[model samples]
Structure formats: C-alpha cells, structure tokens
Target chain A: GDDRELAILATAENLLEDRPLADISVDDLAKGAGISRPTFYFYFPSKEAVLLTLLDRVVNQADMALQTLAENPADTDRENMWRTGINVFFETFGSHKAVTRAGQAARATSVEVAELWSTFMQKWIAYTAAVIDAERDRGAAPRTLPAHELATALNLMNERTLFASFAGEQPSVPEARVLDTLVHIWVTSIYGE
Target chain B: GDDRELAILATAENLLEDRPLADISVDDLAKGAGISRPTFYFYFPSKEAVLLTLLDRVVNQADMALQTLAENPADTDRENMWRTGINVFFETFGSHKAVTRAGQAARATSVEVAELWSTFMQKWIAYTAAVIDAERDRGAAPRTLPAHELATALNLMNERTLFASFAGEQPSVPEARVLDTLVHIWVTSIYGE
Candidate 1:
C-alpha cells in the first residue's frame, strides 16, 4: 500500500533527526522501516532518493506558503505580509535542517540532487520576482535590475544565511538575528526604505 | 624544500580545475606533485589538510585586501573604496573557484575545516562591521541594527551569492549581476537610500 511507502519515508526522516544522511545506510533505513533491502529498493533506489522525496515534500509546503504570499495583494499590510512569508520559509527550513544539510552536502556530488534543488529554487525565484514586479509597477520597488535577477539574489541570500545559521555544525549567528537581518534586507530592497 | 609543499598545494588546486575534489585522491595528488605517498604525508597530513592550507593562503590574500580597505579612510572616496574591495573579493574568489568548491564540500564532513572557514568568515565580519560602524559614526549608515550583526548578514549574503554563481556545478546568475546586486544591497543597507 502507499502507506508502506509513507512509513519508509517517515522512518528515513526520523533517522536524519539522529544522524546525518551519509551515516545512515540503506540497510539501516530498510531495517528501520521493517522492510528488507529488496523492499527498500522497491520504494526508493537509494538514500539520496529518499532525501529527494523528503525535500520534495518540504519544498512543496514552502512553495505553497510563498504562493499564498504571491497571489494575495489585497491584504494591504505589506510589511506584515513580507514578515509572514519570511517566517514560513525559516520555520519550514529550520524544522528539517538535517535533511537540508544532507541535501546541501549531496548537491556537490550528485547532479540529480543539485538539479532538483535548482529547480525548486528557480520556482521560488519566479514567484518572488512576480511580487517584485508588482511592487515595481506600483512604483514601490527598485528598477535598477530586472525583477527576476533581484529575486534570484535575494532568495540566494535567504538560502545561504539560513543554511549557515541553522543547518551547520556551528551556526555563525543567532537564529533571530538571521531572520531579522533577512527581513530587513527584503523589506528595504523592495520598499527602498 | 618548502617549495614542495607549495607544489603539492598547487597540484591539488590544479587537479580540482578539471574534476570534483572528492574524485581526486591523495595518491593522485602525490603523483601529480612528483612526490611519493609518504612524502605527501610528510608535507601534508591529508587531502583535507592540504585544502585548508590552500584556503588559508587564499583567505590571507582576501584578508589583506579587506584590511587595506579598513585602514584607508583618508582616501575621501568611500564609494570607490567599497567597490574596489568588493571587486578584490570577487577576483580572488573567482580565480580559485574550484578550490573554493572543494573547501565547501570538505566542510560538511570535517569539523576542523568548518572551523577554519568559520574563523575566516568571522574575521571578515569584524572588518566589515568596523566599516559599517565608521559609516554610522559619520551619520551615513543605518543604526537600527548593530554594526556587527548587519555586517554578518551582508557578508553571508556575498559569500552565498558568489558561491552559488561562481563556485557551483552551474552558475545560477551572471557574474556582473551578482556583483551589482550585492553592491546594491551593501550600499542600501548601510546608507538606507
């Protein structure tokens, strides 16, 4: 049943909570899921595949959060909306930090994983750029560069800052400071305050 | 001779230009450096150690570049100095893109490497925070956040942006846009204009 596949995914995610993805072998994952190695292969080809599946789910939730922000302009509380969007991103990312670290570590070695991460980033950039374009249309945002380019840079900043602060062995800055600083950048960049 | 160590470091850096760091083994490095495996061991403890050495050297160059900016206030051309400092960073980083990618990859698995990278970042942050503090003292920069925290965030953004665009498997954005966007953020964040 599909529930069996869900069980395997859940087990793998739980494993990530305790140890890195690299240290968790396929045998460990299969045994943890109460399935044989062959059965594990039936649902996922490798641990990386499991990570991709988990990341896909995480990205979908994050995508929805951003999409809601992008689609709604009638709220009129611009600063609050931006803060809400940023919080959702950090919260979602912070919750699954181990998987995020594993995915980040895997990207350099695995083309498939890198491309998957890139695709998700591209989607987020597109949504953010649309928002930036809307703001620029209303004479609210900077026009020195294209919306997509600005969105790209800003999103990378978020990704990098969050990863450094949350997913690493030693976070360089406090979590609240990271969030506040990013929010400040996003708000200022768009509102030109 | 001490030049043997330099030869080994250069060899490893050269090897990275064509392949991923993980794919290049100690034996490969040894052979390429015209040294036996034992001699390689004599010069460097491991491949990761060699990488740290190379990164330390690069950071020293980058450190000098930033230090020059930090020490020079009589130039009376703050804007030009900032741009020149940012360019020095990009040029040094761009020239050794492969080694940077290798160091990034190594940090995930090696605590020593991670700390080394972190220390370099902290040094840069201190230098940048001083610059921001000077600007604020002159009534030219924002005072909403402490100089250290803002500098930390901005430096992380530049590091992340450059790595994503220049040091990755694929460049995410154009070089000029990455530089331009970062300069824009730095200027706007400090000057609030």
Candidate 2:
C-alpha cells in the first residue's frame, strides 16, 4: 500500500513539473512511478479518482481549520477568527496549487467534477453562514440581510480572490493590496460599516 | 453582391440552429446556401470573419440601446440597465446561439477569438466606468472606492448574469430581486452606503 501511494505521489510530482494533468496518461504515470500498470490501478480506480482523493483531503483540511477557528476562537478574539480562516484557506490552497489547477481543468470537462466543486462551495457557504450567525448573536454583525446572503458574499469574495491569484498574470497592484481590499469589502458589506 | 450575402446569411441561419459554429464547414455552408464553394470565400474571408461581422452588429445594437438609455434615463433607469441589457443581449444572441456558444467555447482554444471577447468586455467596462464616474462627479455616489473598482463590479455582475441566463438556469430570484441585490452590493460597497 505504501509503495503504491509513494509511486503515485512521485509520478504526480514529476508529471506536474512540466505537463498539465490532462495530457498525462496512466501508462506514463506508472512508468514514471517505477510501477506496473496494474499497480497504479491497485491504488486508484482512475485518474479522476486520484485527483478527487486529493481534493477531498484538501477540503477536509480547510473544513477542520474553519472548525478550529470557529469553536476555539484563539485568544477569545472573534476578529482573529476571520484572519485565521482566511490564512488557513490560502495556505492550504497555495501549497496544493498543482492539484487545484488539475482539479479545476477536470471540473470544466466533467459535470460530476463541476458538481463536486459546487457542492464544496455550498458547504463553505453554510459554514460561513454559521460563523455569521454566531457573530450576529454576539451583536457584532448587522442582521439587515439574512445570514445566507452574508455567507454568499464571503464565499464570492473568497472565490474571486482565488480566481485572481490563479489567473497567472502580473497583478496591476500588489497581491497584499488585493487581499486587503477583499477584507475591507467583506468587513464593510457584512457589518454595514 | 446582395444576393450572395443573402445566401450566406440564410445558410448561416440554418446552420446555427443545428450545430456550433466551429463545427460547421465552408463546404457545408456553400452547399446549404446553394452557392459554389468559391462563392463562400467571395463574400467572407473565413468563418471567424463572418462571426466577427455578427459580433459587430450585436455590439452596435447594444451601443444604440445604451445611447437611448443615456439620453433619457427617466424612461429606463440605471438600475434597470442589467435587465434591459440582458434582454437585448439575449435577443441578439438568440438568433446565433450556436455561434455564440462557439465563441465562448473558442475562448479556451483560440487567442484571436478570446481577444475579441476580451475587447468587448473592456469596452463594456469603459461604458460602465463612465457611468460610475459621472455619478461620483454629480455627488450622487459616494467616492469611497475608485471608479475602476466599481466598473469591475459591474462587469463581473454582467458576465455572471449572462452566463447564468444563457445556461438556461432560472436566476435564483425574481429579476427585480436580482437587480436590487446586485445594485445594492455594487452601490453600497462603492459609496459606503
């Protein structure tokens, strides 16, 4: 089991360096990993399955980070929760950039993958809604709009930030400036401040 | 010359109902239009050129509609621009839905076509930016964010709305509700309203 997983990881590392995921083949993958064709299948059913596994792991990590930030509330500071959640999201996603790119490309071609991506965003929206609801209970966030709208706004902001980063073009402004602007918009829209 | 153009248009119209523009062949066009193969080239240099001609006409129509709205805002308010724009855009695109679909698909394959779409959006951004700039100058809008940011907001909203509509999914709410939510988010964030 360990050998198979190692082979897959090694193949992924090598293949991602030059070629995009769509161009990579299972035969090439097996050869690169120093494993047989059957060995590759022993671990993963298909190419999509491996990417889905990686995506699930990434999603779990993000979910746990959000949970920790929401429940633990480091230093008993609610504002820090926002900062921590955002930081965790970017850090996790940044580290797995190759897989994320592959997953996005695959999602574009497959309805199932697209649905998976949407489902994750839906969960994220719900998670953000819970965070907003908690803040509302604490008399911090404005309740003028429903919690779902707040969540949708936050999710859209997060998505747009990621889209800009993955655009692979030179930023007109500093990345930090863009992130700060997103934070400002998020805070202003949610709090009506 | 007029007869050749008419033949081409009739052929293109019939083809659009059955297949995407990229999939259609010049031979097929010539045969369907009841013209010689050479006649197809006599009128349009290539299929892309023909599509560009269609895009130009659609863009001109949009411009005229915007001019009308600009000259008399009382007849059609700024907030209703999205609805009017969407209707006009759909009507224009509806006639050549296949080609429109092909153009969007070409975004992933053809840099030339991609630039055409990008240039269209940039012109749109300029128009929206002008409106925002005028509102800001008139003291009707709060000058919290840059005009460019507001323009980007409008552009994103328009892109999202068009894609959503074209895909045959009913917008999540009534047209008025969608407009209100988007405008509120746009105007509120820009003006700190």
Candidate 3:
C-alpha cells in the first residue's frame, strides 16, 4: 500500500514537471509506477486522488508547524511567534511547490480537493482566532476588531498571498521578499507597532 | 477623439456583458459604435486595450477615493476612514465587475493589461503607505512594520481577496461581510486597540 501510493504520487509529481495532471492519464500513472491498470484502480481512485493525498500530506506538515505557533510561551515576543508561523507556511509550500500548485489547480474540477482546502482554511482560521483571543485576554494585545473577523481576513490574506506567490507567472512579490512582507503584515496587524 | 474612444470602451464594456473580451474584436467594436474598423483601431490598439481603459477608469476612481483616506481630518475615527476606504474599494469594483473580470482574465496574455495592473498596484501601494506613515508621524498610529511593506501586503491582499470574491465559483467570504471584514483589518492593523 505504501510504495504503490507513493509510487503513483511520485509519478504524478514527475509527470507534473513535464506537463499538467490533466494531460497525464491514469494508465500513465500506473505504468510509470510499474502497476497494471486494474491494480492501479485497486490502489487509487484517480490522478487527482493521487494529488489530493500528496497535497494533504503537505498541508498536514503546515498544520503541525502552525500548532507550534498556538503553543507559544506566554512571554514570547509576538514578532518571534509570527515569524516562525509565517516562515513555516512559506517553507512548507515552497518545498512542495508541485503538489501545492497541482492540488490548487484542481479547485475547478474536483469537489474533494476544494473541500480539503476549505477544511484546511477553517481549521487554521479558528486556530488563529484563538491565539488572537488569548492575546487580548492576557492583556498583551488590545482588541479592536472581532478576533474571528481579524483571523479570517488574515488567513484569507495568507491564502491569497501564498497562492499568488506560488502560481503567478510573473509574481509581484519576489521569493526573497515574500516572507518578510507577510510576517510584517501579520505582526503589525496583531501586535501593533 | 474623446467621443470615439469613449464609444469604443463603452461598446467593449457592453460587449463583455454578452461575451468575453476575446470574442469581441475591432470589427465588433466599430460596428457596435457605428464606426469603421480603422476608427476602432484608432481608439484602441486591441480589444484588450478596451478592457485596460475601462479597468483603468474604475481603479482611478478607487485611487481618488483612497486619496481621501490620505487626507483624513486628524479627528476622523479610524473606523470611518477605513469604512469609507473599504467601501469605495468594493463599490468601484462591484459596479464594474465585468470590466474588472475581463481585464484580469487577460493577465495571462496581455502586456498592457498586466502593466496597467502593476502600475495600479504601485500607485495605490505608495499612496497607502504614505497614509500609514502620516498617521505614525502624527502620533495617531504607532510605528511597527515599515509602511511600504504593510501597504504592499495589504494591497496585494485586497487584490487577491477581491479577485476571489469576484471570480471564484463559490467565494469564501460572503459579499455581505467582505467590506466589514476588510475594514476591520485595516483599522485593527493600523490603530491597534
């Protein structure tokens, strides 16, 4: 189960390098992974499924890294907290560009993939709101906007910012500058100046 | 000349109601405006150019309204400054959704449209930064993130957030809440508690 799934995932990533997932057939997937079509069907549902598994793995890694932000020391400087959270976000997606790109591209055709992304957003948005709420209660951060509203906008801001950074042909923010820009926005908004 | 150009842009916007910008050509523009092909060309180098002007007009209106944010009455509440700014951002795009959508669609192909967008970003980003910087100088808003960087991320955030709301199959943020959500972030991020 492990090798076959990983094999198909690897082949999808490889073929994705040369062409889009839409062009790479299931037979191509199974053949590249050295499996028969029947066996491939036995192991996986579709190529998008393969991408879903890969993208799901990538997001889980991000989810764990973000959990670190949630568990920050009470006295941890907000900048340090945001810096780590934002860095892991970019680094997780940066290292797994193909999977992230391919998975997101399928928001058009796949119900399950969109659900996966939505669930991911919902989890992180709530997690972020909890942190803001905690900070406000601890008297470390003052409350102005509703914590949930701030978290949703900030999370969506990250989603859109990351998506454009990954997917744009001529990205507005260069790779080197993206992390600092995002960190600044997050910290400045949450902890203030 | 103004009459002829307005006729072309107007016809192009009208044509976008029925079909995409690609389906509308100089011939279509000329016929729609009761002119010859050469006259349409005189008005616009390409159909994409028509979208650029209409989008340009729409954004310029947003730009001028944002300038009003830069000139706040010093006593103006942060929420009102942000509410007005965010409302204009949505209203300008909401009323002219077709032109905005069609013009953005060509970011894939049109140099002029892409440059128009980049120029739009540069102008607004700088304008927004100046406002934040002015607030910091006035001792109204504290200094944290570099104003320019904050503006860059926030502007791009708006660009992506607005793009998704306008173009996505199912938008994440409901239309009813987008303005309040965005305004909340702008105020919270700038004024803190």
Candidate 4:
C-alpha cells in the first residue's frame, strides 16, 4: 500500500513539474501510476484527499521542528525560529505545489476542507504563541506586547508570506526580494523598534 | 443610464440577500431586474463583471476613507486615525457585505481581479507609508524602524481586523468579543515597547 501511494505521489509530482495542479486530472494520475481510475479512488477519497495527506505529513514535520525549538530555546532566536518555520513551510509547499494549489481551489467548494486547513493554521499559530509566551517568561525575548498578539502578527505574516512566495514564483516577480523585505519588516516592526 | 444602472444594482443586491455570490446566476439578476438576459449582458460582460463593478465601487469608497486619513494627519493622532480608519472600513464592509463577499470570491477565481484588489490595498499602504515618512521627518514618529515597515504592519492589522469583524458575525461567535479581542491584540503588538 505504501508502495502504491508512493507511486501515485511520484506520478503526481512528475505531472506537476510542467503543469499546475489545476491542470492535473485523476485520469492522468491513474495512468501515470499504472493503476485503474477506481484504484486511485480506492486509495484516496479524491485528489484533494491525496493532497491533504501530503499537507498532513508536512505539518507533522513542522511540529517536530517546533518541538526541537522548544527543547533548546537558548539556541534559537525568534528570527531563526521564524526562518526555520518559514523555510520548512516553503520547502513543503514547494514540494507539493500542485497539491497545495488544488487545496486552495478546493477551499471555496468544500467547507470541510476549508475548515481543516483553517484549523491547522490556527493551531499552528497557537503553538507559536505558546513558544513566544515561554520565551517571554524566560526573559529571552522583550515583553513589549502580549504573547498572543505577537503570535497573531507573526502568524499573519507567515500566511501572507506563503501566498506571496507562491504567487511571486508562479507569476513573475522578485519573490526573494519580497521575502527579504518582509523579513526585514517583520523584524523591525515587532522586535527591533 | 445611471437610473438603469441603479435598477440593475438594486436587483443584484436583492439577489445577494438570499444566496452567496457563487450561487447567484445572471438569469436571476436579469429576471429580478425585469430585463432580458441579453439586455443584462449589454451592461456587463459576465457574471463576474457585474460583481467586479460593484466591488470596484465599494473599494473606491474604502480608498477614499483611507485618503481622508492621509490628508488629515494634522487633525488626529496615530491611534485615533487608526481607530477611525477601522470604523470606516468595517462599516463599509458591513453595509456592503454581499458586494464584498462577491469580491472575495471573485478574487480567488481571477488573477486580474486579485491583482486589482491587491493594488488597491497597496495604494492604501503606500499612502500610509508616505504619511509615516513625513512624521518621521518631522520627528513625530519613531525613526528606528523604517516608515514602510510601520505602514506594512498597520495594513496587516487592518486586514486581520476586517476579517475578524466579518467572521465574528457568523452564528457561533459574538461579534463584539471578536472585535474587542482583535483591537486588544492589534494595539498591544503594534505599539510594542
């Protein structure tokens, strides 16, 4: 079953190399995986479910990164933590661009999927808030603001940055420059001043 | 011509009261307005075009509200300006919920529409940045962080607060609490020590 899943994923990845997720179809995935259309449906409820699976995996990895940061707070500054978190996010999203794009499109159509994605991000923001709270208590970070506020601002930045990163890459823009500008803005607006 | 457009708008607004924008049809609009379908098409290019026209009108109002803040910097403090700006923004969105909802959905669908919305906000941000820059030059605001950074952070708050206001009005959440909490978080993080 794992091999079958891997085969399907590999095929999807290949298809996404040239075309966006919007262009991919189940039949294409089935053909690429050398499986029947029904088999593809059997393994995953739908194309979105497969993408959600990938998202779940990436989120788990991000959780592990957060845990690592929590264990050694002294080693990682807020910027480094943010960079780590954002890097992991971008890397994961980059890996499954088609799936993520598909997930976004599905959000307006499927309440369940939309809520799932929203809840995932909300929980992640809470986790980051908790980390900020701990850092504040430990005197590792300045206490100009409440933990939740800091978390919310950072979380919003993370969300917007994800979209900017994706859109900047797909369409045509200086994405890296925008990311750099965003990072500078974040650091200055929240902690620096 | 303006009277005819107003008649069309009244019909469109009436149609939105019962259904989400995605569910609305051109037929519904045409039928409601007592116009033939082809005649309805005479005024608008597509279903999206009608929504876009309405949204453009709404965003124009929002932009004007923002420009008021920019032009009247001498009359208010930063905090009051922001508070008034939020009030104006939220009030506009509240009054034009259907049009704004349609705009949000349309933004998700069309790249050009999304860009239009983004460009509109960018102008607001740019205006705020210019005001901040002027204040910094006069030694009124902090010069440590760039004016653009402050503008970006303020714009982020503007967006979050608006969404919170919208989502809070749903059946489950108390809108007042959502707004209070949003304001608390925004003020704390934005005015960090």
lDDT of each: 0.79, 0.63, 0.76, 0.63
True contacts kept of 2: 0.09
i-RMS, each model, one decimal? 2.4, 4.5, 3.6, 6.5
- Which pairs of residues collide in model 3? none
Per-model TM against the reference: 0.92, 0.73, 0.72, 0.81
TM-score of chain A of each: 0.90, 0.85, 0.91, 0.77
The residue-by-residue lDDT of candidate 4 on A6-121, one tens digit each, is 88877876776677556779999889888999999988887766666665665566667666655755466666666665566666665655656656666677776667776776
The best-first sequence of candidates by TM-score reads: 1, 4, 2, 3
Write the number of the candidate with greater DockQ, choosing between 3 and 4.
3
Off by over 4 Å in 4: A74-91, A94-98, A135-150, A169-174, A177-193, B142-157, B168-193
Task: Tell me the lDDT of candidate 2.
Answer: 0.63
| All candidates: DockQ | 0.56, 0.23, 0.29, 0.25
* Model 2, runs deviating above 4 Å: A6-10, A45-49, A74-88, A130-157, A169-174, B1-64, B67-102, B126-150, B168-176
- Scanning candidate 3 chain B in windows of ten residues, the lowest lDDT window is B166-175
By DockQ, highest first, what's the ranking?
A: 1, 3, 4, 2
Docking class of 3: acceptable
Tens digit of per-residue lDDT, candidate 1, span B74-187: 464655656777787899888889887877777777887788888888888888888788878898776877778778778887888888878542426677677777776777
| Model 1 stretches astray by more than 4 angstroms | A168-171, B74-78, B168-171
Candidate scoring better on DockQ of 1 and 4:
1
Considering only chain B, what TM-score does candidate 4 achieve? 0.82
Fnat scores for every prediction:
0.54, 0.09, 0.35, 0.05
Q: Write the per-residue lDDT of candidate 3 for residues B100-134, one digit (tens) a residue.
A: 78877776567877877778788877877887998
